[model samples]
Target: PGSVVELLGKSYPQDDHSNLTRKVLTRVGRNLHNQQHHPLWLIKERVKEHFYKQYVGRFGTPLFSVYDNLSPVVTTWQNFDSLLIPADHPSRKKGDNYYLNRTHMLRAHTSAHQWDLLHAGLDAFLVVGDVYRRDQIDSQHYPIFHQLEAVRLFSKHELFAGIKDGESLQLFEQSSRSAHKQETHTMEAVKLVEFDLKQTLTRLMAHLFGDELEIRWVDCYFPFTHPSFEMEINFHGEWLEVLGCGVMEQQLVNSAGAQDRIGWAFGLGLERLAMILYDIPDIRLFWCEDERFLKQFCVSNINQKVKFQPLSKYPAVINDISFWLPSENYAENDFYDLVRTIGGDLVEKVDLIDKFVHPKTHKTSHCYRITYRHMERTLSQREVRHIHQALQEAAVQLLGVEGRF
Candidate 1:
């Protein structure tokens, strides 16, 4: 909306592909994960503490360096190319990401820094920061959320130490297999790393949940990691995926000068874990400035069982806007982005309530029911009405839609 989009105290020239809204721009510097009383921050501290106790006891000191203050802005090469994501991958589309320009964008995942950190000689580290995505408005999905990335590399000597016939086992495999392990890794090295990865995460979950933990691993895939697996914990009678981990692709480490090492890497969304642990109802509640939400938790409570209580039952105003599409290939994400720009946090939910096609002209119409509500307080009729009117006008001016209601 502005001539120059400012983020992290720097001004970025906007282009035709620029999609950073004022609302999202304001959140770039919020750093909720850095706040003391925030649940996200509490979880970050707890996780770092766990890593410290787990690794320091074995390594004699803090082995995993923590990088929490890195800038969210990253190059496309770092975000996608460095991670081995194909150029035509869907995640790189303009509709799925907040691009500052063609070359720069809000980091979609904390993995964006994997290349930079590894290249800087960080063999083991944790990256905690906010990531951005262009997503639909809902209770569970927020355009901005926090992610914790953990990576640890081990040498051949470390893996085979104290074992019988240790020298017989090698780290690299010459040929590839069918999705079981990387071609560049041996069975022994893969087994060691996988076991370590699973045990580390399992122990961490047990520490967070309790001694009695029910968890299972499911095979998965990622461009950067081969033979990826996701860990799911039985929470409230349901299997909820806590994180994803796998052996790092050998090329990534080799290119970064850690060719002599094999590693495991995993990433977990801080909000997902925090929401589950604290029983937070809405994703937007994490960003609420009201004391009732912010004052509920502290670093002390991170180890205890805690849940959030609603401060007030705010009323919601429902407004429906119907319009005919300007093009047949209308993307819903574009409309959602436009709504987020106009409504900001006050807009709670949006649903396509109705859709119809004309018989003769074959024009398509869509009606969306947008729920407007305030997290800390209530919205008056006049305030909601004004915002809804502006949204309707903007949909036409910005999105090129013919207003029907």
Candidate 2:
């Protein structure tokens, strides 16, 4: 028998109440449920546990704390030394970030934790928590996510002790040998102190996931980590971006109460790892109450099969052209648009490779490269020449540039 239910004069069956109650209870239960039956949940749990265990083993127990908006504060933003962000920096602008009205923000990254944690001059520390951003919905992105951040300090003498001056060549060769043995792949950590620190992270990853994994470093940008890298892993032939890491900024260290101690920091995403390990197509699946999907994940092995395709058989041809323009002229986008319009299917890649300012002429020289390839048929020399001529004419007329072959 259905019972009456009313909200704002709209009435529905009592069975709706039963359904809602069931959903709430099930979600709560799953949240508290053990990992054995929820692969995503279990994987995240395992990653956190493994990371913490490995970190503690390498650096000892880290001083840790958790805070929210409710936590007490000394001052949110101090004019003298508090707001360290540069005025013209993109991050300081409200349009690019989730600012908390005017003075506060939902801390862009876990590095924010440092300002409060470093006040006591703690030797080592780690902060793991969720952060917020206004991101579009996607399979790989969410408006809110988690980050695990770590920091440690050392003195300048400790940083540059073993390496001799102007012996970068010998230092590199020896360092490469040591890194190969340690399974480190980057020259970013060339110094002994940085090398040891990077080695620690490598060991940590290996301890948790076993030794067969491939790790590489790529140049990246972060406000705090001056010389930063985007950590990548080979997952079934596809290189997946895993995390960002590097030595912490000097200003950040000073702000964190370590006026003279140099430090290293890293941030990693737990959900990304969970998705890769479990082959979960959608992240929302972790939060969904669908019993069938959830049940299968519980007992499945972490390393399932992933699919990939071979490289294309078609060959590519690259072309480069430089053009001179007036100092006041700025029509780079218009030139690119014209090239794309004319080049059409033949265009594979287009990039502004170089820009030069002539000291005498005061004119700007722009160099562009356009890569072309055809899947159906290879282009003839005559056809290629014709296209190049047309492209040059279009560039000259549209952008007012004197084209150089």
Candidate 3:
């Protein structure tokens, strides 16, 4: 009746959340694929150019492996089986992935390609492409993003696996030596490979954007890479994580028909690099349509000042305090909050030094060591005394317990 609405065959709004997701995806896709050039796409293009020019010859051209058809997914899943990633492995869980149905899903990582390629006898390969995960979108996280993954094969003749004599027990020892040699070789090889790859990636970045750079490595974890590590770089006084890497699993090698071979691989996020290179504060700026946001990065020739600040000038002073509390009444976060509030800017670090439980009362006693430092001036004895007093009082007030200091 309202304005003679044509409701004869109309239906209610699609209540499914997937519909909303599809709508957002459609908008983003249209913006990315059809409308003006988004900064992210530009970043991707620059990444591809640099990767191809600087990395492809050394690492090999980027490989595209599809998971759309039923065959690929099944093959990958079967390969996943040999890797000892149980059917219920957390990575396979639906909450962590986008299951197209019961049998198919948007591949969660390029590691799947690593398995496929290695299975096909492509000893060394690299893939740069989009990966999907079901995650909350934020400045640092998104349901969709890009990753670069690499896989290399280490043969039996390699130094890590020592050659063994058929019958002698000492063959085992000989094999161990051989294995150690190969291990050393593999580490050296991977280090060189990573070093070159990082140099190339950085060179390309500088060429495109005109900035100097440095890269670093940190201990990290990933399913496919054992002894995994993450790569980071210092830019504008902050550490920016760029990639995940490690040696390949033996089970994976077996699934890939290179069962006897060992290898190393790495995966990197493209957006993180773009955020640093383009100096975009919010990641969403890459997707925004405003010309002002997109124009600055259009040419990519401008250089930005980059420097690393030295560590604090003052020597750190550490104090240890312990307290016994009723098990049911203690909360770690509350205590941390109290310490931070009372210690204020002087608090450099707080660590749980130790914990013990009384056999009789079952009360847990926790020891915490707090470090304090000041950049402009060292803490005077009076200031240290006052800080300790405040710390003790805060602990009692918050936890209803006194420090055993």
Candidate 4:
């Protein structure tokens, strides 16, 4: 038995793999990133404006076309296959994603539209949109978040222009610490693009957070990028990852009909950047309709640094749930999803406090501590008890776990 699920004014059939919940679906039309005075929208505009100032086209217009209105719904091919994510990749698991059906889903990343944009003949563009994923309940994580994905392609002449050996410098040389460039790329071209990519982003970050901001690069991997790297910023003495970027995989650019072009792509979470830039604490506060929270930011403040002031500190209550596993097939994210779905924004965090195996029966038992709190007000004991009881019963009924007294 199945039904139809509607999102962003479109209806999709629900199936066994369908996991999009009403809570997450409600966020589809909110478009928090588009709110002109909101921190997320402000950051996006600031980034776009910075790019416009840095790059110019022949007509004196900006080099990058920004697409902030694209639908969040995408096909499997666009979300995964086009980006070269393997069919069996863990990222494809239903637990990690909110699938609309077997073939459709809420995009987990803005890269879902990368292939389509490149296929549409746009070489340089920015995709800003709401991305979805099932994640643990915490002050930092939310099922729905916004990401700004930037991609820029370069031709051989454009990449090597004004260099001493410009004519001889090639884009693809048969090729990392050991060997950084792919077999389809030349060491010279890779170095050029790598240096350009690093310098560009570094300058952008400095523009947003000021030149005094400490930053560093760490080596990383992504399915669509070769010699990928992550950029981390030192915020308040902590090194926090801000984005993932690297040279675009040759096959992706080539398949998109840009065989003669080389490029780079990077994606960063808007909320993460806003949290750091604006000093917003809880992730739920971004969705908050409270005036005290909304009044702190505005269009005039987009170019300046501001910290969020706490209106009032609220107390949190803790609850624990223990259950015996029905089988080895269950995943931790499954439980996290259930809790976030049922408890919604009231849940502050969920931590796995204990787990053990029965000595004789070999059955596994797991316990998680759920912290219940509200960002705008205190959560009442009666409601917390009701939600906790529902969560326990749901674990037994839907998750097939035996309730442990």
Candidate 5:
């Protein structure tokens, strides 16, 4: 019962396409930077046009927006009630999201289009896509990833009192003395929209961690950022955390009619800053194409940070399966979405080797072990036993599981 399915080329309604995932409805519009010769849409369109020319050359406003093909199908009030999230949250579950039913989904964050681009008045933006999650299975947990949103708004208050002259009110009075302040407006306009969100996020983390990186910031809790924060980074010596930000709440600035605009927002993880700006050691090598990993980044030098050149380590093909439980709410993101819907990204690690229960048929018996690797070839044992016999026959017909074979 299927026909007329054109994705990335439009023509849908093959019954609203079974809630997507034949690689998420064929990457609808592949984050278009004109998808040709793709390299993660040419590194998210040259890092979203170098963050829209460093935020329209430091806030001159082209009324910014860069939404990468928006429509990872939203609405649960545009992904968690306009970013206020919480309805007994477990990321609004189905074993961690991909609903497309009971009110649509498949957008586990590009800050879920922060209230449909702040209800479309957009004071500033960036919302690249490909989000979906039901994760964890190594090489940096991919249940499809990519995100980058920045959102900024701030203008009346007599236009930030001749800004530069106030020098962000003495760096918001010497950074609000260990800043983590929260004001509901006019504490001198929340210290010039909180020093324009920490000096444009410290010139966007020194334009993506350059000038000897080593970040910090701390304190967090985000349901649309309160006194929220999180920007850890030390990389190779371990601190990590990456990005999440604050100062935009007022129920998400009253969901963007900008309730007297005092804002600042953020969200990042363009494959964790393209794996620390292209040192890229396998997040499935951002969907490698094997021209030695797609000719080592290009968009004719998208502000060059290339570095990768390793390629030559493909060999893995192990598969095992056992099953029993069809109750106790079975979930391992529904057995890693039925092994990523039968081995996409050439199935890398499913792990969990054993588990048990069955004292008088109490039911529960597991054993996993499914590693089938292919970073660039070496995965055919009769095509991994015909994809492990259609993954133990679709894990006992779509997971009512009791197969054990």
Candidate 6:
């Protein structure tokens, strides 16, 4: 994109999704997981370690396996079709996804690995790695972000654990009880499943955010999850949705050859959690290698709560670009991804300032204002102009748009 300072020496072609063209070979090193110098990676490891221990302690054995790498690359079938995502699902579009080709792609969610793992006879595991999405530009979004996927299956009889006196399990009630009550479970299977699912996750939220954490659950929908709910945590005086989970649909489990079993799964964004916990201001700061950002975090004791020491704040260089589509075939995410791919996190925001269709030509035109700024330094006018020019040129080349100054 430009002569950016070093540390990373790789660039990917636009379509090398392993599964497209020489058009885009995207650079993905590691999730930065397992690396000590990387705060992002360290946060991921700590989260993984925390969950690993919690699951072990509660289950009285190593109940969960953590996979940071085996779960990284996946085919489209593993990502979408296997998960029961519909062929016409909005997520399948190129504007919102990175496809290697028609048959394969980078995994959009760690959940992509779920079915196969179950097929391979692994019942408990965590999927932690980088996930790709083509999304709008803002303070909290990037094309690549880390996600944590945790799923556990229980045998039909196991779902009736501690079901005494014809009531919900007492394991989560005041005391951890060890008792059995067949409790007519088949008649109330969904209720029993929801009971344990909520019981387990609220405790998980508390574990991650401490006892003072406040959360709420809202009924939601997912292709693979029935009776789904999304969890939002009270953070920084704002309610932030941190994860989505629910009782796994029996059909999904059955498809994995795990018949007569039911389960639950939840996925959360690692970047969002780290930002709130570390008091980091911008999402892009996680990728910065400067001593100011990196030094605030230490190699020793990742457990300590280190409020991010602030870095130099710079003013934004605002620029606007407008374009007319050749037809209705254009995808907005393609344009947004184009900017971020070329500009990196230097792009702070992309807003559609105006959009309209001309009645005569019946063509749509969109005008967007892209705000650019470096979190740690000021942008020179010459550099800003150079980058803005590059974005406009790329827009013309890739989107088949008539760019307007």
Best by lDDT: 4
Name the lDDT of candidate 3: 0.54
RMSD of each: 2.2, 16.6, 14.0, 2.3, 18.1, 6.6
TM-score of each: 0.93, 0.51, 0.51, 0.94, 0.37, 0.85
Task: Order the numbered candidates by lDDT, best leading.
Answer: 4, 1, 6, 5, 2, 3
Clashes of each: 0, 1, 8, 4, 1, 12
Off by over 4 Å in 6: 1-26, 59-62, 164-187, 359-361
Candidate with maximal TM-score: 4
- Assess candidate 1 and give its lDDT: 0.86
Q: Per-model C-alpha lDDT, please?
A: 0.86, 0.55, 0.54, 0.87, 0.70, 0.72
Worst 10 residues of 2 by lDDT: 16-25
Residues 48-147 of candidate 4: C-alpha lDDT, one tens digit per residue: 9788888753342238999999999999899998989998998999888989999999899999999999988898899999999987779999999999
lDDT measured at residue 269 in model 1 versus the true structure, 0 to 100:
88
Worst 10 residues of 3 by lDDT: 168-177
For candidate 5, give the lDDT of residue 6.
49
The digit string of per-residue lDDT tens for model 1 on 81-103 reads 88899988888888899999888
Q: Residue 396, candidate 2: how far off, in angstroms?
A: 43
- Report how far residue 277 has shifted in candidate 4, in Å: 0.6
lDDT of 3 by residue, 5-81 (tens): 11123222221111112312332223231122444455545445554554446543343332211211223364355
Question: Model 3, residue 46: what's the lDDT?
Answer: 49
Error of 2 at 362 (Å): 36
TM-score head-to-head 3 vs 5, winner: 3
Clash count (model 4, backbone only):
4
Which is better, 5 or 6, measured by TM-score? 6
